[PDB]
Amino acid sequence: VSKIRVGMTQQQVAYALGTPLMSDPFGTNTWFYVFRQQPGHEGVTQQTLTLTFNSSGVLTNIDNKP
Amino acid sequence: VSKIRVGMTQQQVAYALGTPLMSDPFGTNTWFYVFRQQPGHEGVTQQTLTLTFNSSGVLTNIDNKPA
Amino acid sequence: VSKIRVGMTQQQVAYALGTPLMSDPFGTNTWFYVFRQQPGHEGVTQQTLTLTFNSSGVLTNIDNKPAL
Amino acid sequence: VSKIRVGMTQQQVAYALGTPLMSDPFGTNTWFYVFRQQPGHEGVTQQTLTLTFNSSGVLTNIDNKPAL
Amino acid sequence: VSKIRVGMTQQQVAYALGTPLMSDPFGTNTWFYVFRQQPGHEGVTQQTLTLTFNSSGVLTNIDNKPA
Amino acid sequence: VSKIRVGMTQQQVAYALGTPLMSDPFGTNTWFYVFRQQPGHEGVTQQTLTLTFNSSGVLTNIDNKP
């Protein structure tokens, strides 16, 4: 924590402390859902969803898995 | 168990599905650390850190409250 | 690990092992909700709620973000 | 939400909103460690540790899994 | 920041990297639920559930302790 | 919780309660790492690792991202 200073880039902070446990999802390019402890789950593997957004915050790819 | 389509904004997707469990931290403005399971913890409350970055990804505020 | 002993205070245990991944919320003074993967979310930041309780486990402060 | 009020007990708040995603570990009676993404892990199940504290925040029970 | 190679067993990978943050629950023997942020919670402790499944994926023990 | 009974398959339980918050990683086919709050992080995106194991518990694929 003394390992960081105002003016550092996200790369410099992440090098010092690691990436954070949480961050705000708005403005970022990738959102990942894992649908746990939600009734109605189906299949032989954990349902997940990866969403890709462009720099304007618009959804460009929907990746279901499976 | 709900409907999205390409071209939706993040507000539309969050209304439909909720915010995601995880998202990529690079490019956003607020990072939040909670230092768990790390030896050397001190104090009477859980140590945390909130960082604010500007539109360019540079750190402008370090909030260690506590405290 | 072997670096903890019965009789230790929560500070000593937290200095040896760090705080735990999880703990029972009853009896503590601060609760933190993060409303994720819940349809109906609104706004331009992640909705959260920080509740402060006194010693008697009574709620004394409600802190919504964003502000209601 | 609007379904909580200052003066509520932790039970009333938990009935209205559920327990929180996170809480401050200090002051509670049970801590639970899950040692993941930590090099050195051994054995055939996930290593965990459950610590029980009394009212004074003093450790009274250590429960390692698997058993040491 | 540590070294794995194809052909390693899960014990070898866990020694090198630790266990993973997440894994697929299907096919294993122990499931653990912690019911957070769900309205209608009752009791003086966090409600949890530990389920044991046999090698075939069938439920053989329901542990609701608490209690 | 009264929604489940001994003898149900993992598919029946997951349909009633959802998948669990946690499960034991040994014996399963996919392990996912997200290296957060670990100093030394590098890059312009969150480092992760997906490992695939066969039914004998042997590592068959290493997928770094990026």
Swiss-Prot record, chains A, F:
It comes from the Bacteria. It is a lipid-anchor. One of its GO terms (molecular function) is identical protein binding. Disruption phenotype: Mutants show minor defects in the assembly of outer membrane proteins. Keywords: Cell outer membrane, Lipoprotein, Membrane, Palmitate, Signal. GO terms for biological process: Gram-negative-bacterium-type cell outer membrane assembly; protein insertion into membrane; response to antibiotic. GO terms for cellular component: Bam protein complex; membrane. It is found in: Cell outer membrane. Disulfide bonds: none annotated. Part of the Bam complex, which is composed of the outer membrane protein BamA, and four lipoproteins BamB, BamC, BamD and BamE. Forms a subcomplex with BamC and BamD. Monomer in the periplasm, but is able to adopt a dimeric conformation in the cytoplasm. The Bam complex has the shape of a hat, with the BamA beta-barrel crown in the outer membrane and the periplasmic brim formed by the BamA POTRA domains and the 4 lipoproteins. The intact Bam complex can have 2 BamE subunits. Part of the outer membrane protein assembly complex (Bam), which is involved in assembly and insertion of beta-barrel proteins into the outer membrane. Nonessential member of the complex that stabilizes the interaction between the essential proteins BamA and BamD. May modulate the conformation of BamA, likely through interactions with BamD. Efficient substrate folding and insertion into the outer membrane requires all 5 subunits. Belongs to the BamE family. This is Outer membrane protein assembly factor BamE. It comes from Escherichia coli (strain K12). The gene is bamE. The chain holds residues 43 to 108 of 113 of the full protein.
